[PDB]
Ligand binder design. Structure first.
Ligand SMILES: [Zn+2]
Lengths: 83, 184, 208, 99, 59, 99
RNA sequence: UGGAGAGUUUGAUCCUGGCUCAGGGUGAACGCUGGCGGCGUGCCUAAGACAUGCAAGUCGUGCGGGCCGCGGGGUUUUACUCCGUGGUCAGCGGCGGACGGGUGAGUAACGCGUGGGUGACCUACCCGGAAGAGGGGGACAACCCGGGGAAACUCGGGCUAAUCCCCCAUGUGGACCCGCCCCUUGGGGUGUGUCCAAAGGGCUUUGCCCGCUUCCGGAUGGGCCCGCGUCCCAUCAGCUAGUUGGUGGGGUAAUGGCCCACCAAGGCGACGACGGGUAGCCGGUCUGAGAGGAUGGCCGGCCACAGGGGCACUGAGACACGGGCCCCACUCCUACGGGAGGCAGCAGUUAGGAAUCUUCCGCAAUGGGCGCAAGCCUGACGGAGCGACGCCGCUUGGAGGAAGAAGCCCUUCGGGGUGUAAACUCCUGAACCCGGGACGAAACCCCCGACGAGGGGACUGACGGUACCGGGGUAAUAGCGCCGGCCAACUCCGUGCCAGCAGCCGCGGUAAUACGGAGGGCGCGAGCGUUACCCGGAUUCACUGGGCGUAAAGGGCGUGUAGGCGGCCUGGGGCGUCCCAUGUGAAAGACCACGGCUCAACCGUGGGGGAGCGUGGGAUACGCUCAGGCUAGACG
């Protein structure tokens, strides 16, 4: 299936995560469909995490089933919140 | 570093106290028989100690070696022109505590006109390098307790070098007694 | 690692004053004045005509010594300069200057470049809040260096300040002599620095 | 957009099959000069409606045989057999230089 | 064999450098001194690295 | 040695057997239908064909033929039967045929 | 935004021209030397053998069963029993084991790269919607007994559940033949006829949750086919017999010579087939002014193989790395009849070999799988260990301080050198010890809100007591190469065509700026040099940008085929060619900008560029092509 998931890049002890859309059976670094956002765990930057919302929503609609952490991140950003 | 310890009963041992025979795996080189095993705080220190030991031994060995072809005018000539022909042999045993014994036994067995020579004596399996060496030197490969590897054996067979495999020391000794010959 | 070892020998080798001690390298003592010739035996000998390569090499060495850096680092800096657009020599020089130690030296925080570097290393030098201990720190313009909180009451620093009390600073620099502060303002151009080095020669040397 | 090609019917020697010479003029990746370079394609003609010496439009298609992956779209112009003749001559020459 | 007098035996274990010699016919290889059975050149003090001899103990 | 994936193999064996039962029987039925069609028995033949079709569908439903393969098979059978019927018969029961 | 040459055939010159060298780099290695820290990275050899440990399972919210445990009895006890249970243990049943991880032998091929196509197709799980889920039957493990067999294991009889299987009913639908319609290859719609559905558990149970069955729509994942690009050898010239096409059928999810029957006799080839060798391919990397040239390590994709070969089974997906069967090879036991194996998973063992790490800790983060969930699993991964194997960062002090100690070295005997170097004064304070001490980890979980959004709660650390901060606190490893010209830097002693050096010219046969040492210098520096390969210089394969009277080089000429190439004018077409637009050209890198780790490496964010390739439009000068004419070429 298709998942919204976090791809580790970066350095040892300096992790960086790509909030990304990809197939379930892939390398956690692998050929992903689209880069929707990015997240730094270490909170080192002011704009530490950011995801484009509309694209994410579209993906969800299509049926992109997110990872739990990813979902949390999305919620934090303001994707799942509706009015 | 200690990888595995295994008693004579045939059981895996994680912990071994004072006074039990353990099959200790984890030494980078094959240590000598009756060598005192010692504990170290770290690895670097151990390495340093080893280096120091090597320095102590090796330098001395070198020195010992160096006081042999002293005169090269006449003495060298005497030592290059050899009357009694020598037979070369290269041994490979199963343990450190048998190879030495074998050597001791065959050092006596040298009174004949043909004088036996050990060029390479190590414990373990024969290989293609050994075969190559034999070819270079005209030497025999003798084995006690260790069977030859298939490839190695094949190589030995086809290239035309003396390959030997044994069960008893006595057998080996007997075999050696045939190698001096007589021509007449 | 540093050069480390005999200093004014290098100066002697070039034949132009290199100011690698500060004082004494100012007085009749840098060995430029007492003796002006290259070190070791054939220094006082007949000076032979040097090859085209050689002159350039000498110049490069002079430069490196003046800035007190490892060769690899220097090379890297040069490469970076080349990559960036402008005047590959002047820009390079500016970049070199931007090395924290050099800046410190300029601001009169320490009387010698090596000394400055040492000071920087030993947490005595602060760049906008944090004590920075690596002289390879490159400072981008409009930025504040200061003598550290707990190093403000040490004798050497005071002496340095006194020395630089009265005598003015470079146009790319400003220093608060009261509170042991020093802003690096402009990025130092070549025209500002009346250095004995010719960058062109260095560039040529590098080329092949 | 299926691959649509221009070429001449060089051989009708088989049932339902037309052989088509497609000549492509591409420049050399290094020397910058155009090479008039040909390739043979075996095309499906369900009627034998097309004949020796016809220039036709050949469409990339779902396969009908092992290297017969082309449908014949339409006939462009019929009777410029000169090219065909040239090809034949070339083929004949190819026979010559064996032994 | 580079070095002021070899140590090499008749069934000596060696390591080969390669890199020609302009004098010698059929010969394209240096023997690298300081390994296996080719021990370091005794009483070298300047160009030790090429000939594999250890640092001398100074007084 | 030894892993709990032997279970899977065992399962597959059983499934294989069931699949074989489904498939071989279906094939046999098809053959029978064809034979019936051969001479022109029609009504019984039609019934047999229908039965075969049903079996095929069942197989598809389970984990045997599946997908469009079953459909293809049906088409192959049915068309063949129809062709055979052209040599005497015509739809007597109504049955598998579209009349 | 970018391009250095030089030494050398000679008595000297000019060239032609090879060789050699500086430059940079490597998955390197070796030698000497060796403080740390960050980060990257480490069998390039035998795809040789492999131990040991682990590397893939999980669901009791699918189901029966054994072993135990409890709460309570029925049970005097003992049973047996009943549930709630707590775990286990194995079985069935399902989902995953086709992902992840490795290696690069083969394969020079639609294998890949690339741009399309698929009216010739699949897609379990995911989401979107639609419609359902009515009844009845059955076997099979486990289990019990009974054997056979040394073991591996295994056959026989019986029992039993279930989301296992079957059968009937319904039909939203779909499946198929036939017809019709619209399309245009098998796409969509419809009619008659035939065929096809399913299955349940969970509770806060009259209510929802998870699952279910059929379908269409999507989503991703592919399968298959084609356009072009894809190493050397012409001393490999003809290759082909399912081979090239057809008709029919089989087989496939689907086309097709994939396979078979039958008919036809083709098909490919010098625009390089077939054959041999070589080689995974690329995104890239290294180099280079660029064009190119070499390479494909790590990282990312794709392929291919899991001792060699062959083949199926099960499923959404394998011809299946830690499944199966079979033959062979080999290792391992055998009660000689037979089985067990497979590290190209991590670690490790050997063996080859110049050479390559730890039988490490962890599920904490991310991701995987299963699961309602907790949670279980995870040698993916996160990290730590070792190696100066790369790259970067810092230390080995700083400030004084002789018209110049000693030591050593030369000297023309005055002196010079080492050298402000040292000693010595002053100052700082890596190491080091204490004191603290992380970011990374806020969620899934619970409760309130409807199990939605939203609100609060709590736990959760391998790294690691590490990084890092606060206090203290020692002056605290310098080595290697070279020093005749290239080429930076020179003297003396010793040696006497010897010993030696050398990459090249060549140095050495008694005053050697080339050998050994010493001083002195110079280059770099925790490194430096040697070796090996690659590029560069090498415009020494020349497209940019070489030449061929005499240097290497014009075939001995003729005619002539392919091929290549082409006069002038006018008009079209618009293939090349240009352009505009768009789509692609993934990410990582490379480039620019900013930002994080005290800097830098490293990394992150954003941006631009980017040959090429498709699609749509345009342009017609120049090729190409068609048409018409001309007379300068050519022919008569
Ligand atoms: Zn000075």
């Amino acid at each position: 299936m298709v998942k919204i998931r976090l791809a580790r890049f970066g350095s040892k002890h300096n992790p960086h995560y790509r909030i990304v859309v990809t197939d379930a059976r892939r390398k956690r670094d692998g050929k992903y469909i689209e880069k929707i956002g990015y997240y730094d765990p270490r909170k080192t930057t002011p704009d530490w995490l950011k995801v484009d919302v509309e694209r994410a929503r579209y993906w969800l609609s299509v049926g992109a089933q997110p990872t739990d952490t990813a979902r949390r991140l999305l919620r934090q950003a303001g994707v799942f919140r509706q009015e | 570093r200690i990888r595995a310890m295994m008693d004579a009963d045939g059981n895996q041992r994680k912990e071994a106290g004072p006074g039990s025979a353990v099959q200790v795996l984890g030494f980078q080189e094959l240590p000598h028989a009756g060598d005192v095993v010692e504990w170290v705080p770290d690895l670097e220190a151990a390495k340093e100690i080893a280096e120091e030991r090597k320095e102590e031994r090796k330098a001395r060995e070198e020195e010992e070696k160096a006081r042999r072809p002293r005169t090269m005018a006449e003495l060298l000539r005497a030592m290059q022109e050899e009357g009694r022909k020598e037979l070369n042999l290269i041994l490979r045993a199963d343990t450190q505590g048998s190879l030495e014994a074998i050597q001791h036994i065959l050092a006596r067995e040298s009174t004949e006109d043909v004088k036996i020579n050990i060029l390479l004596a190590q414990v373990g399996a024969p290989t293609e390098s050994d075969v190559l060496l034999a070819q270079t030197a005209n030497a025999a490969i003798l084995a006690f307790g260790v069977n030859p590897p298939g490839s190695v054996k094949k190589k030995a067979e086809e290239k035309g070098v003396l390959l030997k495999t044994f069960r008893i020391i006595y057998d080996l000794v007997d075999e050696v007694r045939n190698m001096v010959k007589g021509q007449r | 690692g540093r050069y480390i070892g005999p200093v004014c020998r290098l100066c002697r080798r070039e034949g132009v004053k290199l100011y690698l001690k500060g004082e004494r390298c100012y007085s009749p003592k840098c060995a430029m004045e007492r003796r002006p010739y290259p070190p070791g035996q054939h220094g006082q000998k007949r000076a032979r005509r040097p090859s085209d390569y050689a002159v350039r090499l000498r110049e490069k060495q002079k430069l490196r010594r003046i800035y007190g850096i490892s060769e690899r680092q220097f090379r890297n800096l040069f490469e970076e300069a080349s990559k960036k657009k402008g005047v590959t020599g002047s820009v390079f020089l500016g970049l070199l200057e931007s090395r924290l130690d050099n800046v410190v030296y300029r601001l009169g925080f320490a009387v010698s470049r090596r000394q400055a570097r040492q000071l920087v290393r030993h947490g005595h030098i602060t760049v906008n809040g944090r004590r920075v201990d690596l002289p390879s720190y490159r400072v981008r313009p409009g930025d504040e260096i200061a003598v550290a909180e707990k190093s403000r009451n040490l004798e050497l620093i005071r002496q340095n300040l006194e020395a630089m009390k009265g005598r003015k600073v470079g146009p790319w620099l400003s220093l608060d002599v009261e509170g042991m502060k020093g802003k690096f303002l402009r990025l130092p151009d070549r025209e500002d620095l009346a250095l004995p080095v010719n960058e062109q020669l260095v560039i040529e040397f590098y080329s092949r | 957009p299926k691959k649509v090609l221009t070429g001449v019917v060089v051989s009708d020697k088989m049932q339902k099959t037309v052989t088509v010479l497609v000549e492509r003029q591409f420049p050399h990746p290094l020397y910058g000069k155009v090479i008039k370079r040909s390739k043979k394609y075996l095309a499906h003609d369900p009627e034998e409606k097309y004949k020796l010496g016809d220039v036709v439009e050949i469409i990339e298609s779902r396969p009908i045989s092992k290297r017969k992956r082309f449908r014949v779209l339409r006939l462009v112009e019929s009777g410029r057999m000169d090219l065909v003749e040239k090809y034949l001559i070339r083929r004949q020459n190819y026979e010559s230089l064996s032994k | 064999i580079p070095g002021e007098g070899h140590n090499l035996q008749e069934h000596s274990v060696v390591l080969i450098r390669g890199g020609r010699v302009k004098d010698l016919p059929g010969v394209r290889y240096h023997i690298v001194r300081g390994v296996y059975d080719a021990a370091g050149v005794k009483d070298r003090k300047k160009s030790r690295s090429k000939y594999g001899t250890k640092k001398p103990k100074e007084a | 040695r030894n892993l709990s994936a032997l279970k899977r193999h065992r399962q597959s064996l059983k499934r294989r057997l069931r699949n074989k039962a489904k498939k071989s029987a279906i094939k046999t039925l098809s053959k029978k239908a064809i034979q019936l069609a051969q001479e022109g028995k029609a009504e019984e033949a039609l019934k047999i064909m229908r039965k075969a079709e049903s079996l095929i569908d069942k197989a598809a439903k389970g984990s045997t033929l599946h997908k469009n393969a079953a459909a293809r098979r049906k088409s192959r059978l049915m068309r063949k039967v129809r062709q055979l019927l052209e040599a005497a018969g015509a739809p007597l029961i109504g049955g598998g045929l579209s009349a």
